[PDB]
Design a protein around this nucleic acid. Structure first.
Lengths: 68, 143, 140, 64, 67, 143, 140, 63
DNA sequence: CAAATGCTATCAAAAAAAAAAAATGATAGCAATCT
DNA sequence: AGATTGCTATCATTTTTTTTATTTTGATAGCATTG
């Protein structure tokens, strides 16, 4: 998954370029991480693993189909 | 936003739940996933039909005390407007070949209204409804 | 508190409509008769499934301008709460030998949430869901 | 049809104007709706005959 | 004030003529009334009189200019 | 909607309230009338400056327990955006001779943003603010 | 936190800006400095009352793209709650011999609302309004 | 003014897409706005000087 | 190295402005009714 | 016989609706340059 960002404030760019150099990363890598970080923040719950647990707690079910 | 069809929400609860599907559900942000009242019905009935025992009592609890609450406010009713859409999604598909089962029409119709993407293993039907579909059983390629 | 089932509301529209049912529908207070979105969806589909011609077009016209506007505000939605009722009604009957078609269950659960009286030709399904029923093909 | 209402109390007018806007309608549409609802009440529709008519008109149908 | 209601369905219109006639008045008198009652219903509070009372309660006050 | 300035809402409370005005206030739908936080500031200060005694006390209660609560949710603040309007309402007035005072600018400015009408006894200023005014003291004629 | 009275926030712009005030504004943590819409209103009006021209045009440009955006989110509105405070502040001081300009009152009230230390060259008023004050014309 | 982010976790991408729509803005505007906020937090403006200069930049003014 | 970066590009859909058409809100003008 | 009422009409806006440009995203494609 890739995405472009045009018309990015030239000041903002340097600020990010700086932050990346400060850490030992490339600018792209730094974007990836400042992004991935807030994303993990939005992740209040992981539906998949959540339902799975419920599955494992009961040894798994097999609901009837019910649907013409 | 995405609309989960019965069979996906069920996958994890099963014996050897398809890993690829569980992986995809985790790559999701709850507030983006919705359920159709129709689907909740199906789930709720699928539980009710189990032989009385311990398994059914627990599942029923987790079902109503854990799962569902997580979609509070994101459970879509089949209201009058949606009906109009349903009417077209089905008549259309028919006079084009692939006929759609009412149940599947309710879900499609619902999704369409809010231009949502239906996550289902049975995509073979929805695409005939001009609604975006995604099969988490399959791999992602996208161009 | 009367809830018309698909087969009832659509009876008068038929070729040789049953005059007993028409008379009954003519004895009701419109502000007391409801419809399920599921039922409206079935009517709308019935219209939409017609071969193109003047017929399908006038019917649609009426359906939207004359018929349906009379129930505006009283076309009950099938939501979460009602979905729980559905589960009970159907799971119950089914596990006791009486089958209840999803189609019927939907109306049934709806009627059941507002303690309404389902009006229908096939009363079996509803007596089973423990819902007041009335077959307009009769008298009284 | 057109209808002119003159010598309408100022307040009664402010009030209607209020209802209209507070519901996102033009005052004119508001009054039009009001009068519409009243007609609606005054009338007792004959549901049975209403349909059977529309059906006899279109050669009858069968919506399943 | 005055107001003209254009595009009023003849049905509704006839309904209102009927109402008026039945009620012993003119249509313009009927609408004026119908609206009045509605207006009366929205008039929850009367700001003037409401404030007036207070005035009458404390025997009126002259509040400092200030501005 | 209508924005009541200080002098209009003050009238009824006076010794010999102006009949015409009170009547006007009486022909309104409360939920349509509003007040600028500024005007509320004034009314409260006008009360606070009285001599200590029964009158003041009673009036205070009436103010907080009776009047203002009727305007809950409708007391308009002088926020950042309103400030822009403000700066322009006053500047435009100065370049047309007629000067507008800060206080009047605040009120006017507020009214303008929400596109309202100011009900005041001193329409004198406000017209230069390019905002709709109405003197409840005067009469109403043709258009 | 800190609320800048109109005179302080506008000093740096004056012809021969006082260096003690500039240097103090430079020691502050922007994220802790606020402005009252009242103050922001006079700032903007100040720019409006200038003869259309490069000066006015640029000042405006800078005022909207460079200055105010720095306070975005920290520009306190004068609301009902504040109005009450303002009324107590002015009534007390006034019925005690210390006139408080309605101008200053709006600030002192805004400040007294969220417990802030007002920065201004007119310390006298604010002391009387019972609000933390600081004269950036001095040191410390 | 231009940056390309590749090999981006389709999911982190979801998270962003989400915060984007929820605030009614394109996903791009979102990144742009996020990066923009980062830069602002990394920056320490000196309010006095910053004005003192805009001042001398226009010949001085009084309000 | 091949994988990763930093930039510029493509390129087909989505996502301000100019013009055209309704309504709306205010009366204004009469002929035909009622008071 | 003066006020009311029923119907139309005028007209300067508002408010919508439709067209016609312009911008922006999406999504990923080139190309020369480090874990």
């Amino acid at each position: 998954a890739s995405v472009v960002i045009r018309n990015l404030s030239e000041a903002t760019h340097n600020a990010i370029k700086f932050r990346a150099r400060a850490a030992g990363r490339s600018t792209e890598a730094e974007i990836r991480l400042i992004l991935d970080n807030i994303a993990k923040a939005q992740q209040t719950v992981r539906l998949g693993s959540m339902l799975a647990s419920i599955g494992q707690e009961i040894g798994g079910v097999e609901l009837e189909d019910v649907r013409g | 936003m995405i609309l989960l069809d019965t069979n996906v929400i069920s996958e994890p609860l099963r014996p050897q739940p398809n890993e690829r599907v569980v992986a995809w559900l985790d790559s999701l942000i709850l507030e983006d996933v919705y359920l159709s009242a129709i689907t909740v019905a199906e789930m709720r009935l699928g539980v009710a039909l189990l032989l009385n025992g311990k398994k059914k009592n627990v599942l029923h609890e987790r079902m109503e005390q854990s799962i569902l609450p997580l979609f509070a406010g994101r459970i879509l009713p089949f209201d009058e407007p949606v009906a109009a859409i349903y009417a077209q999604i089905r008549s259309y598909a028919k006079t084009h070949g692939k006929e759609i089962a009412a149940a599947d029409g309710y879900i499609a119709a619902t999704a369409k209204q809010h231009s949502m993407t239906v996550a289902t293993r049975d995509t073979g039907s929805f695409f005939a409804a001009d609604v975006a579909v995604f099969n988490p059983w399959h791999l992602e390629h996208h161009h």
